[PDB]
Every structure is written in C-alpha cells, then in structure tokens.
C-alpha cells in the first residue's frame, strides 16, 4: 500500500485532528448528554516506504471507542508499543475514535424566556466561551427558535449580526470571530396572537454552530517518530505540522 520507491525534494508531513462535539443541555445548565466523535487524517509526503510510531494522551486521561486503518498493526508478540504502522503516501484516515468523559465544552449558552400574558414574549440569550483567551473560534451561529404564531420580532445584538427568519421560525445570530473566556448577548422581543390554547408549543432547543482551533476531547498529539531503514533520513529531518479543528456537530441547549 506504499508500493514502489517514493521520491520528494523535502520530506515533510501534516497531521489533521478533526472532532465534532455533540451536546444536549438543560435550561438551568446541566451537561446531561454529550460526546465527541473524532478522526485523525494524515497527509504524509515522504521518500521511501517508512515506519511510524504515533502517540497521544490516552488512559492525560480519556478515550471510549476507536478503530485504525488496516496499515496499523497494534500487536507484535502481545500488547502495544503505541500505534505502529507503515503509512501510505499522501492523505489517509489513520484512526477514528469517540470519547465521552472529561468533555471540554467550548461554549455555554444560557436562555431567559419571559412572557407578558399571551401577547408579547421577552428573550435574552447569552453565550460564553470556555477555552483559551488567545484562541480564535470562527463560524459562530446561534439559532433561537420562535413560535409558529409570531406577529413580528424585534432584535439587537452586542457582537455579530442577527436577523429573524420567518420561514425557518428562528432568529439567526452570526458571529465571525470570538475568543476565549469572553461574553456576548442577544436580546429579542417577539409578538404573538393565540389561537387553539392546547397544543402549548413544544419549545425547541437553541442550536449552536462553531469551528474552534482546539480538540474538544482534550486530546493532543504527543509525538510521531518517523524511521526509514533503506535511506538515511529520519524524525528530526521531517518538518511536522499539527492542526486541531473542532466542528460543532449537534450543540443544543434550553431542553
């Protein structure tokens, strides 16, 4: 699967770590169900079919379920000397994993619903980052679900841009960038007109999307030693860059 002799002008490699942090949260603020699905993609461009030993903080704690690419062979006269493999050239999916414990949720979102009779409806949602203040969360979107009978809505937001979509029955609040341990808020006034008085509105949860540049399992790459017997070069010769990307997945709250 790394067939023939590979040949390149400068031997470097790139690791991508990709994690989707799923979360259902109660309106008070209780982590009641949440997991992170994960995958490690490796774009290795190196000369001659080499050996690699890859490592990371399992047992700095945590890791539920996982699977490796067929190249990996975890056992040689019993046990494991980490993940140990003969990488194919270019881009491939090294391993795919899941984790539930020691969970590191990037944002915490807090609703405040308050009704004036059955005519008006006051809303204030607040979002807080819970990661390094030096880091750069992008593509933030907060979707606040309006009722199906809505006369009209009024909205203002401290950071970002927000607007009520009639079709989608939700206010869509977008923020281009936000850094860690910072706070922002949207507050909204929703007008109504009550019809049937029985189907009392199964209040949908507030959904969030975000890309973050950290792995919300808590995983970090410890090392990946590259060795090559046939040729002369090895692990100090290779230039190694790593990247963590935290996709949203399903990130609900106010349920």
């Amino acid at each position: 699967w790394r067939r023939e002799g590979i040949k390149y002008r400068r031997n470097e490699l790139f690791l991508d770590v990709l994690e989707s942090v799923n979360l259902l949260m109660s309106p008070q603020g209780q982590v009641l169900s949440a997991h992170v699905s994960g995958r490690v993609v490796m774009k290795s461009y190196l000369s001659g079919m080499p050996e690699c030993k890859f490592g990371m903080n399992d047992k700095s704690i945590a890791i539920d379920d996982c699977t490796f690419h067929q190249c990996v062979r975890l056992s040689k006269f019993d046990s494991e000397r980490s993940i140990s493999f003969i990488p194919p050239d270019g881009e491939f999916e090294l391993m795919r994993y899941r984790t539930t414990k020691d969970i590191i949720l990037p944002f915490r979102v807090i609703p405040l619903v308050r009704e004036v009779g059955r005519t008006k409806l006051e809303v204030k949602v607040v979002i807080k980052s819970n990661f390094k203040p030096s880091l750069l969360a992008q593509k933030i979107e907060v979707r606040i679900p309006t009722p199906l009978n809505t006369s009209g809505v009024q909205v203002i937001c401290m950071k970002g841009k927000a607007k009520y979509k009639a079709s989608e029955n939700a206010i869509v609040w977008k923020i281009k960038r936000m850094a860690g341990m910072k706070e922002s808020q949207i507050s909204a006034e929703i007008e109504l007109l009550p019809t049937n008085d029985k189907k009392k509105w199964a209040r949908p949860p507030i959904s969030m999307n975000f890309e973050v540049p950290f792995a919300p399992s808590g995983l970090k790459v410890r090392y990946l030693k590259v060795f090559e017997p046939k040729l002369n070069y090895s692990d100090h010769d290779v230039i190694k860059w790593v990247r963590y990307i935290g996709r949203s997945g399903i990130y609900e709250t106010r349920c």
């Binding site: 790139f14 690791l15 750069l136 540049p213 790459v221 090392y223 990946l224 230039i239 190694k240 860059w241 790593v242 990247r243």
Partner: peptide, 6 residues
C-alpha cells in the same frame, strides 16, 4: 491553525 510539533 497549523503550529509545529517537535
């Protein structure tokens, strides 16, 4: 972003 790993 891409930062370096020893």
């Amino acid at each position: 972003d891409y930062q370096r790993l020893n």
